[PDB]
Structures are given as structure tokens and as C-alpha cells.
């Protein structure tokens, strides 16, 4: 559950470097993190994560220092479930131990959903073409409201209507094995977020 968060944290880090990034997986949790260079005297006790939700007083969240593969230092904080109410604004603040600013943001729990990668991707060739079938991401609610996207490598990327977990690829260049992968996102009305990681590729 932490090796996947490791992959999830590295996923968002590529899109928004130098930012504070938050995401939820089950709509009851929230994990915020950021990445910076290692400093000699600075650890998790040199920054202060504070959040304020609804009219409850400003609460403090515990920061955790962990290294990344790219050499940077990742600081992350996991907000408790009791404070994760999905549809109200949540103010976040990261203040340096000197009093200086670092990050300040307002997010909505529902607007920052990062699902798991889909599993059990199976490709079988029926004459026409290849039909792809897969399972939804594990431990993810509201399957009927999950949008998918398939990737073909030789590249082609096809969108899948929410709810559907299978597709047929019409025209292809030849009977050679193509590499397929699928990723999932949260659809609508109020929900939104980021593309999940790719599934285990198949040929």
C-alpha cells in the first residue's frame, strides 16, 4: 500500500514539480507531499503542515521524510479520515521553522482523486483485430463512474466510455504483437482528478 503510494507520488511529481501535490484514493483519505533538495540541518521537524476545514480550528499534520529515486527528499503528510469531508474547501499551509512561507493552497477532496492502476488486462485476437478486457482498479468505489484509456505501442490511445471495461480495436497494421496498457480516471459530475498509472503491459 506504500510501494503503490511510492509509484503514485513519483507519478504526480513529474507533472507538477516545485508544487505541493495532494491526492485521494478512496475519497476518505488524503496524502499531500512535495519534493525538495536535501539540506544539512533540515528534516521533517523543520516544516509545519497545517490545515483548516469547515469552521474547525487549524489542525497540524505530521510530516514524514523519505528519499526518492531521483535523489530529492519527499515530505508527505496523511490527513486523518475524520477531517476528510469530500465537498468543502480545505486550506493547506506549509510553513518553515523560521516562520517563512513554503506552500499555501486550497483544494477540494473530490477534485483530487488518483485511482489505482487497472488489473487483469487480457488481449485476445478475434478476426476482423484484438479485443481487450480488463478489471477495474482494486478497492475503488463507483465502478460505473470510472473512465478508462488504452494505449497501443508499435502509438495509439483510445478513450473508453465510463463503465465499459472492454474494447475492440478496428484497424491495425498487421498481425504482429502490439503492446497494450490501460489507465483509469474518475469521471463526473463533481468528481475529478488525475490519470492513474498504466496497467501491466501485454503483447
Amino acid at each position: 500500500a506504500d510501494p503503490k503510494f511510492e509509484s503514485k507520488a513519483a507519478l504526480l511529481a513529474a507533472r507538477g514539480p516545485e508544487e505541493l501535490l495532494c491526492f485521494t484514493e478512496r475519497l476518505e483519505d488524503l496524502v499531500c507531499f512535495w519534493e525538495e533538495a536535501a539540506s544539512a540541518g533540515v528534516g521533517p521537524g523543520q516544516y509545519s503542515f497545517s490545515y483548516q476545514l469547515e469552521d474547525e480550528p487549524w489542525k497540524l499534520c505530521r510530516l514524514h521524510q523519505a528519499p526518492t529515486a531521483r535523489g530529492a527528499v519527499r515530505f508527505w503528510c496523511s490527513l486523518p479520515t475524520a477531517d476528510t469531508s469530500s465537498f468543502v474547501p480545505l486550506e493547506l499551509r506549509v510553513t518553515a521553522a523560521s516562520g517563512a512561507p513554503r506552500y499555501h493552497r486550497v483544494i477540494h477532496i473530490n477534485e483530487v482523486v488518483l485511482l489505482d492502476a487497472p488489473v487483469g488486462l487480457v488481449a485476445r485476437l478475434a478476426d476482423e483485430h484484438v479485443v481487450l478486457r480488463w478489471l477495474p482498479p482494486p478497492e475503488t468505489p463507483m465502478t460505473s463512474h470510472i473512465r478508462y484509456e488504452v494505449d497501443v505501442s508499435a502509438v495509439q490511445r483510445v478513450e473508453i466510455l465510463e463503465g465499459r471495461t472492454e474494447c475492440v480495436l478496428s484497424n491495425l497494421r498487421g498481425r504482429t504483437r502490439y503492446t497494450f496498457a490501460v489507465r483509469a480516471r474518475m469521471a463526473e459530475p463533481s468528481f475529478g482528478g488525475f490519470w492513474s498509472a498504466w496497467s501491466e503491459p501485454v503483447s
Binding site: 516545485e18 469552521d55 474547501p89 486550506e91 510553513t95 516562520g99 517563512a100 512561507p101 499555501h104 486550497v106
Partner: protein
Amino acid sequence: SDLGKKLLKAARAGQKDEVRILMANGADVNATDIWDATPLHLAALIGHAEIVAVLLENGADVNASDITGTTPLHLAATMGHDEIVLILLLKGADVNAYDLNGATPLHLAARMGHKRIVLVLILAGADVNAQDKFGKTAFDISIDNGNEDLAKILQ
């Protein structure tokens, strides 16, 4: 006051109509939270341009600073809100106001790679040479992030 706190909550939530109601009821347009952030601080961070215009029309301090020294121009610059940067600039925001790290909105915009905000700030009268507490200029931050397009502008 009770109304002053609800004005901040309404600006954070991006509720345009509620802000107008609370203003007419006599709410302090510069009501501060525990961090001394005004409702203009939160509207700039959220990126609501209608509410920013309303608060400014009712006498909000465009150069208000919080505990950290962050002005509403810093928040609009970092989050990448091009219109609110321009609106605050026309209202009379200080391009060269710095926070506790000595970073002007030109520094924060340069770190996030917001090229147009960087160009807007220079046009408004930003000091390109100005350095933060660490001694790095806006040009020095672009070189560290590999933004060659940004670095050529700050020369």
C-alpha cells in the same frame, strides 16, 4: 467578528453572491484569520477574479501581508492566475514586495515556469536583479530548473 469570519470562508469557497451579501451587511473587507490573511488573500489563491474585483471595489488592501509576508500578488503569481495578477497590478500592487524569504512575485512566478506572469511582472516594473534570502535572482532560479525560455527573458 462573526460576519468577518464568514466573509473569509465565503471567499475561500468561491461564493460570489454570498460575498456581496456580507459586504452590504458591513463586514470588514480586511478581516484577518489566525495567519493575518485577508479575504483578498484567499480569493487570489483560489483564483476567483469576480470576488477579487468585488473585494477591491469595497476598499480591500491590495498590499496586505500575512504572518509569512505573503501578499495577494504572491499567491496569484505562484498559482498561475494571469488575470488576477493583472487586476491586482492595476489596483496598485507592489511588484517588489517580498515575503519572509525575500522573494518577490517575480521569484515565485519564475519557479513555477509561468512565462506570461513573469513578462507581466517585468512590464509592471519588477526588479530582475533583486535576490531573495538565499541570494538567488529570478534569473538564477530559471537556470536551476532548466527553463531556457524563461532564462533568456530575465537577462
